[PDB]
Amino acid sequence: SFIKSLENRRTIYALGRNVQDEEKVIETIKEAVRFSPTAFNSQTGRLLILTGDAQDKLWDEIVAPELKAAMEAAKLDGFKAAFGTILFFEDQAVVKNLQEQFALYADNFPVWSEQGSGIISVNVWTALAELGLGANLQHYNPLIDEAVAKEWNLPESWKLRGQLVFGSIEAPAGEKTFMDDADRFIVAK
């Protein structure tokens, strides 16, 4: 079922490169984003999908040095060891255009775009889990934004929101608790 697909998506930190069909993975990522709703069908999400040498470069040559430099003012190997990283961005040029066209809702578009980023991130994450791949969601934005845009020649309007590290599952998800239903759901007739 759909609910089963949701339940099967988990944060997996222990990731490897035992990925059988990279083309199918890419196809699935694209479909998960394609079929995600966005306010006014604005489709503000943008993805940079890195594998292979690009995956190694992101972690060794961008994240590690940017983090070290930022600290002066391990886990990184576990992220590198994964098959790839999907960097999720929101296109600010579209957001701004919508704000101008519908000034009535100018304040809403940034909010809906942020919601949109969450939406496409989890849809991709869950789609990957259905292929038997694990993933985890990181936030090294805004630290790495400039270096990523330069290395892969991204438009200035792409605002980095999240990095979904993915690969073969090499150890199970940890334990997870849930709130009491009574504290978050109220049903009235």
Ligand X SMILES: Cc1cc2nc3c(=O)[nH]c(=O)nc-3n(C[C@H](O)[C@H](O)[C@H](O)COP(=O)(O)O)c2cc1C
Question: What residues line the site for ligand X (CB under 6 A)?
Answer: 10-11, 37-41, 112, 115-116, 118-119, 136-139, 173, 176
Closer CB to ligand X, 28 or 138, in the complex: 138
CB of 174 to ligand X, least distance (A): 7
| Concatenated DSSP letters of 48-74 | EEEEHHHHHHIIIIIIHHHHHHHH---
Instruction: For residue 95, give Cα distances in angstroms to 38, 43, 100, 109, 141.
Output: 12, 10, 9, 6, 19
Closer CB to ligand X, 22 or 90, in the complex: 90
According to CB under 8 A, which one of 71, 72, 104, 189 is a site residue for its own copies? 189
According to CB under 8 A, which one of 21, 37, 70, 150 is a site residue for its own copies? 37
Give the contacts of 106 (CB within 8 A, at least 6 positions apart).
Answer: 99, 100
Length reported for the chain: 189
Which residue has the CB atom at the shortest distance from ligand X? 37
According to CB under 8 A, which one of 72, 74, 177, 182 is a site residue for its own copies? 177
The answer to whether 159 and 142 have CB atoms below 8 angstroms apart is no
